[PDB]
From a paper:
The human [name] forms fusion proteins in certain types of malignant leukaemia, is a critical component of the permeability barrier of the nuclear pore complex and is mislocalized in cytosolic deposits in Alzheimer’s disease. Key to these [name] activities is its large FG-repeat domain with a high number of FG motifs. The most aggregation-prone segment comprises residues 85–124 (named Nup98FG85).
To gain insight into the molecular organization of cohesive FG-repeat interactions, Nup98FG85 was allowed to aggregate in pure water. EM revealed the formation of well-defined and mostly separated amyloid fibrils. Using cryo-EM, we determined the structures of four different fibril polymorphs (pm1–pm4). The least populated polymorph, pm4, was reconstructed at a resolution of 3.4 Å and contains two protofilaments related by an approximate 21 screw symmetry. The most common motif shared by the four polymorphs is a 13-residue β-turn/β-arch structure. A leucine-phenylalanine pair (L91-F92) is located at the tip of the β-turn, with both side chains pointing away from the turn. Most of the stabilizing interactions arise where there are clusters of two to four phenylalanine rings and one or more leucine side chains. We obtained values of approximately −20 kcal mol–1 per chain for the four Nup98FG85 fibril structures.
Author numbering:
A (entry chain D), B (entry chain F), C (entry chain H), D (entry chain J), E (entry chain B), F (entry chain K), ...: 87 to 119
């Protein structure tokens, strides 16, 4: 009754977001001007 | 009764978002101007 | 009663989003102006 | 009673979205202006 | 009744955000001008 | 006795190469394996 | 007796190469494996 | 007897190479594995 | 008898290389594994 | 008998290399593993 | 008989290398493992 094990490797500029219960997770937003 | 193990490798500029219960996950949004 | 193991390799600029229960997952959105 | 193992390789600019129960998954949306 | 163990490796400029109950987690926001 | 002003707009994955005297300019070459 | 002003705008992943005298300019080469 | 002014704007992951006399300028080369 | 003024703006992950006399300038080379 | 003034602005992770006489200038090389 | 004035602004993680006579200048090399 669980997620499990989620990994990443050798990744430049990288964001993971881990939860049991996420509401609206996001990838980056706003780079540059 | 679970997700399992989800991995990535050697990926530039990479975002994964892992949950048991996601609502509206997203990839990047807003780069540039 | 599970997903299994979903991986990626050697992928530039890459987002995966993993869940047991996704609602409206998305790929990138908004690059450029 | 499961998905199985779905992988990708050597793919530029690539998004996979993995779930047991997806509602409305999407590929990219909004690049350019 | 848990998440599990989610790790990352050898990742430049990287933010993970881990919770049992996230509301609106985010990746970076605002780089540049 | 000149080229003039050559511009591009809102173009994904784009290379222009500008010169007074080009010899063998090229577009991309080698993507994938 | 000149090139002029060559600009680009809002272009993802973009390389221009500007010279008075180019020999063999190139666009990208080698992405992936 | 000159190039002129060559600019770029709001471009993700971008390389320009400017010279009076270029020999073999290049765009990216080798991303991924 | 000159290049002129070559500028860039609001560009993520960007390399320009400027000279009066370039031999073999290059864009990135080797990201990932 | 000169280059001129070459500038950049608001650029994340950026390398310019300026000379009167360059031999083999380079952009990044080796990120990741 | 000179380069001129080459500047940069508001650039995260940035290396310029300036000379009258460069041999093999380089951008970063070796980040990660």
């Amino acid at each position: 009754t669980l997620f499990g094990t989620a990994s990443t490797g050798t990744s430049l500029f990288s964001s993971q977001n881990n939860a049991f219960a996420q509401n609206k997770p996001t990838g980056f937003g706003n780079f540059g001007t």
